[PDB]
Amino acid sequence: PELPEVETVRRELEKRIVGQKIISIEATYPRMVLTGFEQLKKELTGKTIQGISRRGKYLIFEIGDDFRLISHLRMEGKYRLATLDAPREKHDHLTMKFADGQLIYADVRKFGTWELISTDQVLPYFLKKKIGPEPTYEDFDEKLFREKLRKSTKKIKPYLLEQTLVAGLGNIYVDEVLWLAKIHPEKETNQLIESSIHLLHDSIIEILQKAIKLGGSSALGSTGKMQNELQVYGKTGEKCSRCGAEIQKIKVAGRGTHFCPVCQQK
Template identity: 75%
Template sequence: MPELPEVETVRRGLEKEVVGLPIRGIEATYPRMVLTGFEQLQKTLQGQTITGISRRGKYLIFEIGEHWRLISHLRMEGKYRLAVLDEPLRKHDHLSIKFDDKQLIYSDVRKFGTWELILTDQLVSYFLQKKIGPEPTYEAFDEEIFREKLKKSTKKIKPYLLEQSLVTGLGNIYVDEALWYSKIHPETRANLLDDRSVHELHDAIIELLQKAVRLGGSSIRTYSALGTTGKMQDELQVYGKAETPCSRCGTKIQKIKVGGRGTHFCPTCQIKIG
């Protein structure tokens, strides 16, 4: 699943290619992907202009004129690509935005991705309902609030981070990586983490995701940003490294299930507490 760095990389690519372009039409082979109704979307956006593209967590936000926002979530395997106008849609292409001389195609093998069209003034309440945490920056992600939330929870730290309520943008890859950097076992209960561990985890999340953004994300399995591969996969320390030596201590990386998710960790560096 694309995580924050991958989604941000897609956002930057789309921003360069489609901002300022008037929408000449929208087609769908799987209209159910538009949760707010495809016909309404088609009617409302015809002739409108994409004025910007922003992001909140893993959500892409197409800014359509002054009044509308199209929210796109890539889920497991969603991706965008640009094509010439007359290129026919492929098997897993489900939505297409037509411009004057090109089209933006959304494809999704599993059909889990979604589009939602909302009014601009509904944007804040939309994300409040999603209970999404702060962006992973030093300005937005307050360490003290993070610490207090962890102290009140008996949840295992990995599933808790994946919920998006503590901080947004983390998925399976970067949670494993952040826990390795901060030497925290993925099954440790949140309220058992001491102040040092919380501080190191807080900073690891921010610095790891910022680095991943700089490197264009991790191109693993199906992810690419408008056909361009990222380089963060070359920097990963534990994710996908089962049975290879830990770069810090030499112990073989293990893979277990935590909260139903495949989880990579070093059994020497990351000792379970409690």
């Protein structure tokens, strides 16, 4: 999940579990609770879910008066709302049981994480992670973005993936954004001119907001439509919609990287 997929999950959870009292919590893989499973079970059992927020790719359950459960889905994490009698599935790891159903977390690769912290610890938690601004016109200041790009020799794709210039891009939307902005993923950032940086800035906001509107690319969130709008990601060998050149795939800083060699000049 990237930011649009996490936001989609957030919205669905907000609609359905806000106001629910947690009756019990069970784990078959307690080790994914980085702050300690038995501790979380003791603290949250009997508390009511008050809200669900998001920061970058992180989900934040607001529970009780002053608890915040920070959940990261990493590569394959999936939530679903199931009946209390639902059968166990192979990669289900945790469940919060309510009176009329349960929220189950599954993750084939076991990468996803849960951390229980307090309300006043949330802002420091994200400062420590060095997460950059949300991708909105209000929060994503082009001027600082420009200054950071000017002073780095990092390649644009991996720098964007750091979450530090702006929060929320993963492999799919970084590839999509760079195609939209006509920038090659290996471009050193200090080579980008002002007009390119402006187009990149706006393209990041536009692509992510579009993906949110379309419910993400493809349990909660599994109804997305953004996948039908992808121009390069996973489109190796197909033709660029703009110029007709074949989309190419290369490896950049360890990641599969899809681009048009005409539209995105090296």
